Every structure is written in structure tokens, then in C-alpha cells.
């Protein structure tokens, strides 16, 4: 078990890597690609790639050595960086569901409205939030328990477990993952709404002469809008909740499976790649940069 | 398949008017934009005029106040009143759908063409 559990660490590494990486590539190399939703791609990208390079190879060690090899300081700026780079990703998610939405439901008022430099600056967001979130209280030791068993971790240079206070772990969750959740509900909800209202018009037009039914087109849609907001939950939900549940009664979820949690949130940083770039333009890209 | 079956151009004296039509079968996604390019002789394809499902419009200045997009409420069906046609206006004239169906990205349609000559 132990043996597959490490090589399946080994892929997961590796699909991040490769997969944002050939993201970044195509966008950089395509001037077709270089879109305005793509912009927020981008930084999609960027934020699952240092997942890849850095925050999960370090992870992965963790779980096999069973301890913190490389000291205290260092457990402190590789969880920065996790929550730093979570914390972009989700919140560009949830950017994008706007900005899709936005330029589906009203593309006219979305173009004169959505300029770049009003991207680069919700982008710049983002990251600045992102920051603020991670490092500035864990670096300063805001999101310190005072609790003994805590007390015992963060003087052990060997322990690097995440334990916060109620405080941080509400907030840090709040603003990392429930808001961009409920926005992104909110968001593709409205697509779904604007979608079925369209179709009722057209149904009212006919003079009682057709019903509208689902053709290829709204069943596609209705599926890529499941796998958008299925997967994104999947990952990243069962962790936090689990982050809540264990400022109040700890002893409640074991270890081991709030771990794991954290692992299948990883995880989505490999997904993000395969779903948001399936574009014809992206694929052409793709084919010309695997020669 | 998708396909958009252009009509209503031809030849037309300066002060005059035409009605374009394009006509798309096949399965489209509720959410859309169907509009009207054209492409003057060694010039560039330019946008005329668009129509989201919604019923929000899009005109370019040169046309503004003679032209005129609309689309059928039943079926995908766009039409382009043109009114007061200037010799400027002489051009291949093309039909476009913008599809939203995979939300992330947007599918073009485009139509073989239909030339639309003004004469003075």
C-alpha cells in the first residue's frame, strides 16, 4: 500500500508540471491564444504550476520521512506558499466564472467594461489577497494556537502539521474557498437560468407550433458546467470542511484522512490544465509544441 | 452539422435597400451571437452588425442609423436591414454564429459569403 501511495505522489507531481507548464507555453507562444480570458488562465496556471514545483514535492517527503527535514523557518515558508498559491487558484476560478459568464450573458457590455488593464488589475487581486491571507499571518504568527499540544509542534523542527487557531482557520477558509464557492454557484447558476429562460422565449415565439427540447449543444454545456463546479468541490470541499470541523472538536476526523483530503486538493491543480484549455485554438497549440 | 445559408444580396442602386438573411440549421447553443461581416475588395473583414440571444445589438459607426439587425424569435434566423446604401457599402457580406455552448470558449460558424455590389 505504502509503495503505491508514494508513486501515485510521483504521477501527481508530474501531471501538474507537465500540464501547466504546456498551458503557460501555448498562451505565451500563440498569438491567437493571447485572449482576455485566457489572461486569468494564466494565473490559474502559474498558481497550480508552484503547487507542482515546489509545495507538493515537499509535501510528499512529509508523508514518507514521517517529519520536517528541512527546519522551521522553511515549514513556515513552504505553508505560506501553500496557502498562498491555493488561495490564487481558487480565487481565479471563481474570477473566470465571472468573466465567462459575464461574457456569455452580456458579451456587448463585457467587451467596453472587461479591458486588460481592468483584467491585470483584478489579476493583481488576487495575488495581493492571496498574500495577505498566507503569508503576512503565518510568517507573523497570527494564525498561532495557544492550546499546549500546538505549543509542542511549533517548537519541534521535526513537526510541521497545520494546526491554527478558531480565528484563522474560519477566515483563511472563508476568503480562500467558501466565497469564490458560493460566487461560482451563484455565477454558473445564472448561465443555467439565462439559458432556460432563452429557451421558454423561444418556445412563447412558435405560437404553440414546437416545444424546445435538450439537443446536443445544452446537454454538452449542462455536462462541461457539472465537471466545472463537480471536480472544483470534489478536490477541495471534503479538506475544508474538515479545516472547520477541527477548530471546534478536533478529535472528531483522524489525521490520515484530512491528510488525504489535502492530497485530493492537490490534485485539482493537475485537473485545472484539462478542463479550462480544451479550446480548438489551445489543442492546435499543443500538437505544435509536442513537435 | 451547423450550416448558415446566406441570401437577399445582389446589386443595387446608391440610395437604395437590401435585406440579408441567414438562415442556421443545426444545433446551436441558447446562448449565442449571430451577426454580419464584410469584406470590401483588398481591404480587411470588419464587423457590421451583431445580435445576442438576449436581445442586445452591436452596430460599427459606418453603419449606424441605416442598418438594421434582427432575428427570428422561433428559429436561428438573422436578418440585416440595410437601408441607404452608399458605393462605401459594396462587399462580400458574411454570416457568423458565436456559440457559447462550452462555456469556457466560444465555437465559430461562418458562412460562404454573399456579395453585395452598390453602384452609384
Known amino acids: 500500500a505504502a509503495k503505491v501511495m508514494s508513486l501515485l505522489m510521483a504521477l501527481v507531481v508530474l501531471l501538474i508540471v507537465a500540464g501547466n507548464v504546456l498551458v503557460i507555453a501555448a498562451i505565451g507562444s500563440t498569438q491567437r491564444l493571447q485572449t482576455l480570458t485566457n489572461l486569468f488562465i494564466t494565473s490559474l496556471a502559474c498558481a497550480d504550476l508552484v503547487v507542482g514545483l515546489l509545495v507538493v514535492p515537499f509535501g510528499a517527503t512529509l508523508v514518507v520521512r514521517g517529519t520536517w527535514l528541512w527546519g522551521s523557518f522553511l515549514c513556515e515558508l513552504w505553508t505560506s506558499l501553500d496557502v498562498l498559491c491555493v488561495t490564487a487558484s481558487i480565487e481565479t476560478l471563481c474570477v473566470i466564472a465571472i468573466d465567462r459568464y459575464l461574457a456569455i450573458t452580456s458579451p456587448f457590455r463585457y467587451q467596453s467594461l472587461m479591458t486588460r488593464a481592468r483584467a491585470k488589475v483584478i489579476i493583481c487581486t488576487v495575488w495581493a489577497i492571496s498574500a495577505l491571507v498566507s503569508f503576512l499571518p503565518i510568517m507573523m504568527h497570527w494564525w498561532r494556537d495557544e492550546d499546549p499540544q500546538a505549543l509542542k509542534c511549533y517548537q519541534d523542527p521535526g513537526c510541521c502539521d497545520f494546526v491554527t487557531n478558531r480565528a484563522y482557520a474560519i477566515a483563511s477558509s472563508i476568503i480562500s474557498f467558501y466565497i469564490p464557492l458560493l460566487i461560482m454557484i451563484f455565477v454558473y447558476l445564472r448561465v443555467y437560468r439565462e439559458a432556460k429562460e432563452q429557451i421558454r422565449k423561444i418556445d412563447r415565439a412558435s405560437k404553440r407550433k414546437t416545444s424546445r427540447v435538450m439537443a446536443m449543444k445544452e446537454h454538452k454545456a449542462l455536462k462541461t458546467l457539472g465537471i466545472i463546479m463537480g471536480v472544483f468541490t470534489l478536490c477541495w470541499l471534503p479538506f475544508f470542511l474538515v479545516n472547520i470541523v477541527n477548530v471546534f472538536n478536533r478529535d472528531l476526523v483522524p489525521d490520515w484522512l484530512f491528510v488525504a483530503f489535502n492530497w485530493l486538493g492537490y490534485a485539482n491543480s493537475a485537473m485545472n490544465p484539462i478542463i479550462y484549455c480544451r479550446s480548438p485554438d489551445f489543442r492546435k497549440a499543443f500538437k505544435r509544441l509536442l513537435a | 452539422q451547423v450550416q448558415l445559408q446566406e441570401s437577399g444580396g445582389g446589386l443595387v442602386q446608391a440610395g437604395g435597400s437590401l435585406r440579408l438573411s441567414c438562415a442556421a440549421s443545426?444545433?446551436?447553443?441558447?446562448?449565442?451571437?449571430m451577426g454580419w461581416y464584410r469584406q470590401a475588395p483588398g481591404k480587411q473583414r470588419e464587423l457590421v452588425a451583431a445580435?445576442?440571444?438576449?436581445?442586445?445589438?452591436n452596430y460599427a459607426n459606418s453603419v449606424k442609423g441605416r442598418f438594421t439587425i434582427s432575428r427570428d424569435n422561433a428559429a436561428n434566423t438573422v436578418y440585416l436591414q440595410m437601408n441607404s446604401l452608399k458605393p462605401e457599402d459594396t462587399a462580400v457580406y458574411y454570416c457568423?454564429?458565436?456559440?457559447?455552448?462550452?462555456?469556457?470558449?466560444?465555437?465559430?460558424?461562418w458562412g460562404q459569403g454573399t456579395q453585395v455590389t452598390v453602384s452609384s
Open positions: 457568423n454564429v458565436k456559440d457559447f455552448g462550452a462555456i469556457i470558449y466560444d465555437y465559430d460558424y
Open positions: 443545426g444545433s446551436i447553443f441558447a446562448l449565442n451571437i
Open positions: 445580435i445576442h440571444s438576449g436581445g442586445t445589438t
